[PDB]
Design a protein around this ligand. Structure first.
Ligand SMILES: O=C(O)c1cc(Br)ccc1N[C@@H]1CCCNC1
Ligand SMILES: O=C(O)c1cc(Br)ccc1N[C@@H]1CCCNC1
Ligand SMILES: O=C([O-])c1cc(Br)ccc1N[C@H]1CCCNC1
Lengths: 156, 156
């Protein structure tokens, strides 16, 4: 039905989608200002790590500080093949994409990192309250020259 | 309130019940879950140590692979299930946890727990593509397989 509440849900979803689009297309020096898309207390980070616990960066200003690190470690990163999924919750989106770029971690050789990624984006008052990245850490191991453990799958 | 929109709302409602049934299937019922798929439907694991998916193609193959997975994961349960509808009535995402005994040939019996994202694409009210995304490092741990530790220097 065309009710005021349905219209507000649509307007919210439309505004939030634009912010996900902006986030996913932010490159180069603009990455240093991407934290401004978050709530003051917004969280972002990497939910799939070798330790099994997330690396969560808490707060808009922490996210900005971290972005200085990221731009060194991934100096030319781009997201590609971006597919944005709206959900029944106008404040929750998922993205499936790929990503490629140089990886420059201290203690490892410089390499070329490519992966497939899923991102979750939760909004509040039109700003990102929680962003989470999910990927396969094994691909990042390969990019760093770290030997990837193998699972034998007998009888599969 | 057009019949196009009405067709889509029903498609989505129907597909969501299929996703619910899939996610709640346990025990011997797992032997018949393949019946939820199109004849040519594909299921499998998109996040693997090799970087390549383990794609199980076809309803009959899916039913055959269920026999092996009921040996390897005899008491598997999905929990904490959150279903996400999308703008496509034939595309859903699920975020959930899962755990169970892991009983692979040639590895100590373990307890495997992980966080999962599942993609479900439909055609004609059945599953045409199911894809599981997880952190393989957690499966390594469950099998006693050593997991390398990525050092993140400069990380605040
Ligand atoms: O892209 C950035 O600006 C960025 C900013 C923060 Br803060 C953390 C990580 C970042 N980028 C990496 C690229 C490789 C895949 N993981 C995310
Ligand atoms: O649960 C099933 O019946 C099942 C069926 C097929 Br065919 C393949 C794998 C299965 N289970 C594993 C459990 C641990 C996480 N990955 C999925
Ligand atoms: O490891 C998984 O969770 C898994 C997921 C999907 Br789908 C299919 C097969 C899987 N594992 C095989 C490994 C070899 C022994 N049989 C179980």
């Amino acid at each position: 039905e065309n009710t005021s509440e349905n219209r507000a849900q649509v307007a919210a979803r439309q505004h939030n989608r634009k912010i996900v689009e902006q986030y996913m297309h932010t490159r180069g020096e603009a990455r240093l200002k991407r934290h401004l898309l978050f709530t003051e207390d917004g969280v972002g980070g990497l939910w799939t790590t070798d330790s099994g616990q997330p690396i969560a960066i808490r707060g808009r200003e922490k996210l900005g500080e971290h972005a200085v690190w990221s731009l060194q470690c991934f100096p030319d990163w781009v997201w590609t093949d971006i597919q944005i999924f709206e959900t029944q919750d106008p404040n929750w989106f998922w993205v499936e994409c790929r990503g490629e770029g140089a990886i420059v971690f201290p203690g490892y050789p410089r390499g070329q990192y490519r992966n497939h990624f899923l991102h979750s984006f939760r909004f509040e008052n039109g700003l990102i309250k929680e962003q989470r990245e999910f990927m396969n850490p094994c691909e990042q191991f390969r990019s760093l020259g770290i030997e990837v453990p193998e699972v034998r799958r007998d009888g599969l």
